[PDB]
Ligand binder design. Structure first.
Ligand SMILES: *[C@@H]1O[C@H](CO)[C@@H](O[C@@H]2O[C@H](CO)[C@@H](O[C@@H]3O[C@H](CO)[C@@H](O[C@@H]4O[C@H](CO)[C@@H](O)[C@H](O)[C@H]4NC(C)=O)[C@H](O[C@H]4O[C@H](CO)[C@@H](O)[C@H](O)[C@@H]4O)[C@@H]3O)[C@H](O)[C@H]2NC(C)=O)[C@H](O)[C@H]1NC(C)=O
Ligand SMILES: CNC(=O)[C@H](Cc1c[nH]c2ccccc12)NC(=O)[C@@H](CC(=O)NO)CC(C)C
Ligand SMILES: [Ca+2]
Ligand SMILES: [Ca+2]
Ligand SMILES: [Ca+2]
Ligand SMILES: [Zn+2]
Length: 414
C-alpha cells in the first residue's frame, strides 16, 4: 500500500560553516526535517526514511553555485557517478547555505529512482525546521512527478506544499491535485526502487515509535494510537500484543508466522530463485539472484541481475510480434558512430563499435509484422537514446555477453 523513499541528504560546506562546524547540530536538523517530511507524505501513502547523510565539512565535492540549474546538474552527475555506486538509496537532496539565484529550491520532475535525476537541491532558507521541511517535501514532490498547483487545486484553507512560492505561514498539506498527479506518475511509470521497505538498521535517524517506520528496538510500529489499525501491535509502545508472533513483514499473516515454505518473493526468471518463509520468522529473506553468467533459457542467454536478457525478447518488447534478431550485417551500422549507431558514450560523445563489439550497440531487428519488410529495424528516440541499445549482459555470441558496450567472454565477464 505504502511506497518508501530511502533518502540520502548531503550538506554543503557553506552550511557547515554557517553552523560553525557543529555536525551534531546539523545532523539533528536533518533528522527533524525528514521526520516532518515523512509526516507530510503520510497523506500520500508514501513513507520517507533517511538512510544516509554526507556532510562536506572539508571541501564540497562539486562546485556549489548560485545558478541553481548548474548546481542541480552537477549534484545529479555526482550522485550518479559517485554516491549511488557506493550507497543504495532512492533519492538524494543537497542542502546549501548558498543563496541560489531566483529560487530557494530546484528539482527534476517525474524522475524518482533515476540515477542522475532522482535529486533536488534545497536552500537552507530558514532556521525554522518546518519551513525547510516544506521546501524538501516540495522538491521531492517534483521528483515524484508533481507539478505546481493552480486553478481549482485545493488542500483546504491552507497554503499547499506545491504552490510556486513558499508561504510565510506554510502548512504541511498537499492539494488534491498533488495527490492524483503523484499517483498517476507512480502507476504509469512505476518507479521500482521505492517498492522495498527499508530495514530498521538501514535508517540512520534516532528511532521514533509512532512514525510508522519499523526501527531498531521496535517489535512493530503502526503510528499513533489514533491511526493504528494493526491489531497485532500496541501503538503507544511499539510492542506486540494479544496472540501475536509478529506484527510486520511479508512472512507475517494475521500476526503469526507464515508456515515454512510459503513463497514470499516470486521468481522473476530462472536466474532469480524465489525466497520462502522459514515458518519461524516474520520477514522474507533478502532477495537472492543466481550468479551472473550462468546459462539460461536453454543456452540462448546468460544470467544478468536476476534476468536472462536475449535479443529475441528485446526485439519483442520494443516492436511487438513477428519481429526477431536481425542478420549480423545489420549490426555493422554500429560502427558508424552516428546518432543511433554506436556502442557507448564518453564525455557525451557517441563511440562507434569496434567490429568485434557491433552486437552490443544499437539493437537491430528483422520486422516481418503485417505488411512490413524491414530487415534492420532499430529503435531510436532522443527522449532517451539508451532505449533500443542492446541490454547489458545480453548474449552476443557463443560464450560471450555484452558488458559496457563490449562483447566479451562470459567466463571472465563476472
Ligand atoms: C480538487 O478539489 C477541489 C475542491 O475544493 C475541486 O474544485 C472544484 O473543481 C471543479 C472543476 O474540476 C469546479 O467545477 C467548475 O466550477 C465552475 C464554477 O462554478 C463551473 O462553471 C460554471 O458552470 C455553470 C454551470 O455548470 C455555469 O452556469 C457558469 O456560467 C460557469 N461559470 C463560469 C464563469 O465558467 C464549471 O463548469 C463549466 O465547465 C464544465 C467543464 O469542466 C462544463 O461542463 C460546464 O458546462 C461549465 O461550462 C465547473 O463545474 C468546482 O467549482 C471546484 N470547486 C470549488 C470549491 O472550487 C477540484 O476540481 C479538485 N481537483 C482535483 C485535481 O481533484
Ligand atoms: C522565496 N522564493 C520563492 O518562494 C520562489 C517564488 C517564485 C514564484 N514563481 C517563481 C518562478 C521562478 C522563480 C521563483 C518563483 N519560489 C521558489 O523558490 C520555489 C521554486 C520551485 O518551484 N522549485 O521547485 C520553491 C519554493 C516554493 C519551496
Ligand atoms: Ca528503495
Ligand atoms: Ca518507528
Ligand atoms: Ca530471489
Ligand atoms: Zn517547484
Amino acid at each position: 500500500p505504502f511506497r518508501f523513499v530511502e533518502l540520502v541528504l548531503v550538506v554543503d560546506k557553506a552550511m557547515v560553516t554557517k553552523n560553525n562546524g557543529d555536525l551534531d547540530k546539523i545532523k539533528t536538523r536533518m533528522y527533524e526535517i525528514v521526520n516532518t517530511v515523512n509526516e507530510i507524505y503520510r497523506y500520500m501513502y508514501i513513507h520517507v526514511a533517511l538512510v544516509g547523510l554526507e556532510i562536506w565539512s572539508n571541501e564540497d565535492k562539486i562546485t556549489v553555485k548560485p545558478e541553481a540549474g548548474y548546481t542541480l546538474n552537477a549534484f545529479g552527475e555526482w550522485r550518479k557517478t559517485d554516491l549511488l555506486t557506493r550507497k543504495k538509496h532512492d533519492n538524494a537532496q543537497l542542502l546549501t547555505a548558498i543563496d541560489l539565484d531566483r529560487v530557494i529550491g530546484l528539482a527534476y520532475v517525474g524522475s524518482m529512482c533515476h540515477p542522475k535525476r532522482s535529486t533536488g537541491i534545497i536552500q537552507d532558507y530558514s532556521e525554522i525546521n518546518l519551513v525547510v521541511a516544506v521546501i524538501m517535501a516540495h522538491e521531492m514532490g517534483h521528483n515524484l512527478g508533481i507539478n505546481h498547483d493552480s486553478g481549482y487545486c485545493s488542500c483546504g484553507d491552507y497554503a499547499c506544499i506545491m504552490r510556486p512560492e513558499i508561504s510565510p505561514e506554510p502548512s504541511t498539506f498537499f492539494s488534491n491535485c498533488s495527490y492524483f498527479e503523484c499517483w498517476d506518475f507512480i502507476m504509469n511509470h512505476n518507479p521500482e526502487c521505492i517498492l522495498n521497505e527499508p530495514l530498521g538498521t538501514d535508517i540512520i535517524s534516532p528511532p521514533v515509535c509512532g512514525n510508522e517506520l519499523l526501527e531498531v528496538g521496535e517489535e512493530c510500529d503502526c503510528g499513533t494510537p489514533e491511526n493504528c489499525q494493526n491489531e497485532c501491535c500496541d501503538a503507544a509502545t511499539c510492542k506486540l500484543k494479544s496472540g501475536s508472533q509478529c506484527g510486520h513483514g511479508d512472512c507475517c499473516e494475521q500476526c503469526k508466522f507464515s508456515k515454512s515454505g510459503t513463497e514470499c518473493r516470486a521468481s522473476m526468471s530462472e536466474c532469480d530463485p524465489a525466497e520462502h518463509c522459514t515458518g519461524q520468522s516474520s520477514e522474507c529473506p533478502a532477495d537472492v539472484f543466481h550468479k551472473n553468467g550462468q546459462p539460461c533459457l536453454d543456452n540462448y542467454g546468460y544470467c544478468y541481475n536476476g534476468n536472462c536478457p536475449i535479443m529475441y525478447h528485446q526485439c519483442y518488447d520494443l516492436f511487438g510480434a513477428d519481429v526477431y534478431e536481425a542478420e549480423d550485417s545489420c549490426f555493422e551500422r554500429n560502427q558508424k558512430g552516428n546518432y543511433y549507431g554506436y556502442c557507448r558514450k564518453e564525455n557525451g560523445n557517441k563511440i562507434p563499435c569496434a567490429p568485434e563489439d557491433v552486437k552490443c550497440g544499437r539493437l537491430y531487428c528483422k520486422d516481418n509484422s503485417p505488411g512490413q519488410n524491414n530487415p534492420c529495424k532499430m529503435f531510436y528516440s532522443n527522449e532517451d537514446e539508451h532505449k533500443g541499445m542492446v541490454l547489458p549482459g545480453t548474449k552476443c555470441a557463443d560464450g560471450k555477453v555484452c558488458s559496457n558496450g563490449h562483447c566479451v567472454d562470459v567466463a571472465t565477464a563476472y
